[PDB]
């Protein structure tokens, strides 16, 4: 309930960059970025787990108009 | 090797199978007798040292008793015959 | 559980004590015998012990079969087309069945090559003149219920039911 799925991100974005971008709406407790270990590139999706479900819902509701590297990043509940 | 092949060619051209070498020289039909009393008339396309023959457009005739026996014969396009069943091989048949 | 080709293919087929090919099918409780043609006439004895077959029917054409073991069952009726499917049948084991009437063994005389029969532990054998009727029905059988036929029994069978 406290985890939000962020998609539509480019492969050039980093996990400290995503943690700094997610810190503008609330402190993120954990950030998981699934990436292939054979190629060393991200899959364009990540999971941000906050400290509560209401803060995660407020972060997912305020990230509907975020643009990174020209691509719109979508936030959904997970 | 080459010397064994030359000796085999000399034994096929000047030995007992030289009449079989007449089957591959002018492509004449030969008469071969089998163990089941079936005479095969036809030319020999390929031969070997163990009298194994490869016949093309052969006619196999035999006598089958049903009285008096009839001369039931058949015609095969291509056939192969082993040297174990060959009894007598005639170079120039009568008819 | 019904009998199919998978139960016959997974069964153990080996050499029996009578120097014949036998396939063991004990402990199956098959209510009906069917799809027995997968053996391709490569067996001489078929065991059907501990089965719930109510009627001995549905046998395919098998010429290599020479022994039938249908003991420990509940066969109440017998099939009529048994001689046309097994022409070389010699041994028939129908012990511990539910035969009550004497008319049930009337197709059993259709097998001309039958010489061995076993109808012990059956209610049909408790009736009077059962062995005489079995001798008068099928004269080709020489051993009935582990007992050889008699000339006086054959004379009593030919004299009775005239």
């Amino acid at each position: 309930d406290a985890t939000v799925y962020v998609g539509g991100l480019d492969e050039k974005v980093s996990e400290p960059l995503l943690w700094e971008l997610f810190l503008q709406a609330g402190p993120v407790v954990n950030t998981h970025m699934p990436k292939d270990r054979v190629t060393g590139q991200h899959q364009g999706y990540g999971f941000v787990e906050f400290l509560s479900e209401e803060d995660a819902d407020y972060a997912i509701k305020i990230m509907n108009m975020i643009k990174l590297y020209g691509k719109p990043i979508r936030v959904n509940k997970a | 090797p080459e010397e064994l092949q030359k000796r085999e060619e000399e034994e096929f051209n000047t030995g007992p199978l030289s009449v079989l070498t007449q089957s591959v020289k002018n492509n004449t039909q030969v008469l071969i007798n089998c163990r089941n009393n079936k005479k095969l008339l036809g030319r020999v396309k390929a031969f070997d040292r163990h009298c194994n023959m490869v016949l093309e457009n052969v006619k196999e005739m035999w006598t089958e008793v049903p009285s008096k026996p009839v001369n039931k014969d058949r015609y095969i396009s291509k056939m192969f015959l082993r040297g174990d069943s060959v009894i007598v091989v005639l170079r120039n048949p009568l008819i | 559980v019904k009998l199919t080709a998978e139960l016959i293919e997974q069964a153990a087929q080996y050499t029996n004590a009578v120097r014949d090919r036998e396939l063991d099918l004990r402990g199956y409780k098959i209510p009906v015998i069917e799809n027995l043609g997968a053996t391709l006439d490569q067996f001489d004895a078929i065991d059907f012990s501990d089965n719930e077959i109510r009627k001995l029917d549905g046998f395919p054409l098998l010429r290599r079969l020479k022994t039938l073991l249908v003991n420990n069952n509940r066969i109440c009726r017998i099939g009529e087309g048994l001689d046309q499917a097994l022409p070389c049948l010699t041994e028939l084991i129908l012990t511990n069945n539910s035969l009550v009437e004497l008319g049930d063994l009337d197709p059993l005389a259709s097998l001309k090559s039958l010489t061995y029969l076993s109808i012990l532990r059956n209610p049909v054998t408790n009736k009077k003149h059962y062995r005489l009727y079995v001798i008068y029905k099928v004269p080709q059988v020489r051993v009935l219920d582990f007992q050889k036929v008699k000339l006086k029994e054959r004379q009593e069978a030919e004299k009775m039911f005239k």
Binding site: - | - | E9, A12, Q13, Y14, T15, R19, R21, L40, Q42
Partner: protein
């Protein structure tokens, strides 16, 4: 090739030169067309020698049978390995 070893330990029937057929589990073979048939049964057809008599085949089981290549004519598969 290995075509003769592909049908090993299976219920194969080999036809003899005298007309009999030996069916058994051919477990071992050799280059001289020999066969080792475990639980083998040999069946030989008998002549009727009459006008109304049918043709029968007497079959007898022998067990492990070592058949040489001089008597074997052709071998055919009959049943899978049990």
């Amino acid at each position: 090739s290995s075509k003769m070893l592909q049908h090993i330990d299976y219920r194969m029937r080999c036809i003899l030169q005298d007309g009999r057929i030996f069916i058994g589990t051919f477990k071992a073979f050799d280059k001289h067309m020999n066969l080792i048939l475990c639980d083998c049964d040999e069946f030989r057809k008998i002549k009727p020698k009459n006008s109304k008599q049918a043709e029968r085949e007497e079959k007898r089981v022998l067990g492990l049978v070592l058949l040489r290549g001089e008597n074997l004519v052709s071998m055919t598969v009959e049943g899978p390995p049990p």
